[PDB]
């Protein structure tokens, strides 16, 4: 029986929560990921840093669909991210869709993920999650949005941001280039430029993972005949689609 019913994260004399600080350090080591909000979309992007070349890195998905209009990326511990994605997909249903018959708005799904992360910071016998998330989404009444969630459970909305390794440089790069009139293609172009700085090796469609929240894709719905159902706004760009935009770089 789990006999660790006491907190493993506690306050030190200086007021610090050590385990949260250390989770944040694990995030700091993580591969860079970023997101940029345009007027008509959001882009999230990261590097697919393949662990061996015998690994098939398209089978490792760092950018994840949470709902048809919400996607997530991370920096830090991959396995922690994968389980959070499973829980986030589920909670979108159990605490929202099965009640209201519609997917949650971005900010409330973020809220639910954040709560899960907060509880790993206070509940008995567990450590905090060693990841920061960037969550991009659209919903009818709030439009496009982009949030960061940290190991403490704190979340903040951004116009554009970066997390992980090269984030201090990437954020300065983004402050120069961001304005409130970017069109989604502009934000994609800026994302690719920003991401090049933190990437050492190969830089192409097979080593970059990029997704957008944009227009509804009726072609990805899987059925026709219900006028109000127009398709998911989340879309992962292909290897080829990324490379096309890398000549325009």
């Amino acid at each position: 029986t789990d006999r660790y019913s006491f907190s493993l994260t506690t306050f030190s004399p200086s007021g610090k929560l050590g385990q949260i600080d250390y989770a944040l350090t694990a995030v700091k080591q993580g591969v860079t990921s970023l997101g940029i909000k345009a007027t008509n979309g959001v882009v999230i992007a990261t590097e697919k840093k393949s662990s061996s070349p015998l690994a098939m890195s398209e089978t490792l998905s760092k950018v994840s669909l949470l709902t048809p209009d919400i996607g997530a990326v991370y920096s830090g511990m991959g396995p922690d991210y994968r389980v959070l994605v499973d829980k986030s997909r589920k909670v979108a249903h159990t605490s929202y869709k099965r009640i209201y018959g519609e997917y949650p708005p971005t900010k409330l799904l973020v809220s639910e993920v954040a709560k899960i992360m907060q509880e790993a910071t206070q509940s008995g016998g567990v450590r905090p999650f060693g990841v920061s998330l960037l969550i991009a989404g659209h919903d009818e009444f709030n439009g496009f949005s982009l949030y960061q969630v940290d190991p403490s459970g704190s979340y903040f909305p951004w116009k554009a941001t970066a997390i992980g390794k090269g984030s201090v440089a990437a954020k300065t790069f983004l402050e120069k280039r961001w304005n409130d009139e970017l069109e989604l293609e502009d934000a994609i172009h800026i994302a690719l430029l920003t991401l090049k700085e933190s990437v050492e090796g190969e830089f192409n469609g097979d080593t970059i993972e990029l997704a957008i929240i944009g227009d509804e894709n009726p072609d990805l719905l899987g059925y026709t005949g219900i006028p109000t159902d127009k398709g998911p706004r989340f879309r992962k760009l292909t290897s080829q689609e990324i490379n096309d935009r890398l000549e325009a770089l």
Binding site: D2, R3, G18, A26, L54, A55, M56, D80, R127
Partner: protein, 241 residues
């Protein structure tokens, strides 16, 4: 220094108990390797029976998880069998609930999630094993998915595990750089097995008798292991060319 004893973060954001579980993974001093054919997935592993009082037929690190899925384990046998039993239970339950055979990659993910939990919950220790799952999947074709004590997993064109994984890995990488395809372009699994043994011999710089190896083969709708005699017939064909 209690951040070294349980799965909490060190001041550099590390999990030492996970790192040490990876170290236990090489305690059997066994190397294994897996490759993909056109129709099959082959896994081979060294077999060492260092005691004459042992019944060698009971010494194995290859497991038949379901009809379609095989698993080779790198690590001590108690943790290996713990993982094998669990994987068998999960595969059977999956088929009962969802009405179709559990895919290789989904089982790997599931076992990887369980492993992730041991790295976050203090009362559970990580298992000191690396798990290589193989099948010929009905949607994805020949499949290799490998899990470790960090709860990480990924699919492979080919892979190797053990004290000398690097030599085997670089040998395999060199071959695939040449061939430029994601698999062994061979019709028969017999030849894919011969390829696998041949490249292990090159990479380790050692020869094998029929009792020095363990072989597992996945084909459409089954996974099976080879007898010493099927292996002998493999070895003979390798020597005669």
């Amino acid at each position: 220094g209690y951040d070294r004893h349980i799965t909490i973060f060190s001041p550099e954001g590390r999990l030492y108990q996970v790192e040490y579980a990876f170290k236990a993974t090489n305690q059997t001093n066994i190397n294994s390797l897996a490759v993909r054919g056109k129709d099959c997935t082959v896994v081979i592993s060294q077999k060492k029976v260092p005691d004459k009082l042992l019944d060698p037929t009971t010494v194995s690190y290859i497991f038949c998880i379901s009809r379609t899925i095989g698993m080779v384990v790198n690590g001590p046998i108690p943790d290996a069998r713990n993982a094998a039993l669990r994987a068998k239970a999960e595969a059977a339950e999956f088929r009962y609930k969802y009405g179709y055979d559990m895919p290789c990659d989904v089982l790997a993910k599931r076992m990887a999630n369980l492993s992730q939990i041991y790295t976050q919950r203090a009362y559970m220790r990580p298992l000191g094993v690396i798990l290589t799952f193989v099948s010929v999947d009905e949607e994805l074709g020949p499949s290799i998915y490998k899990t470790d004590p960090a709860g990480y997993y990924v699919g492979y064109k080919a892979t190797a595990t053990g004290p000398k994984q690097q030599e085997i890995t670089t040998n395999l990488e060199n071959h695939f750089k040449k061939s430029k395809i994601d698999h062994i372009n061979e019709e028969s699994w017999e030849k894919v097995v011969e390829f696998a043994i041949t490249h292990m011999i090159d990479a380790l710089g050692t020869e094998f008798s029929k009792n020095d190896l363990e072989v597992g083969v996945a084909t459409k709708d089954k996974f099976f292991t080879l007898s010493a005699e099927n292996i002998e017939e493999r070895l003979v064909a390798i020597a005669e060319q």
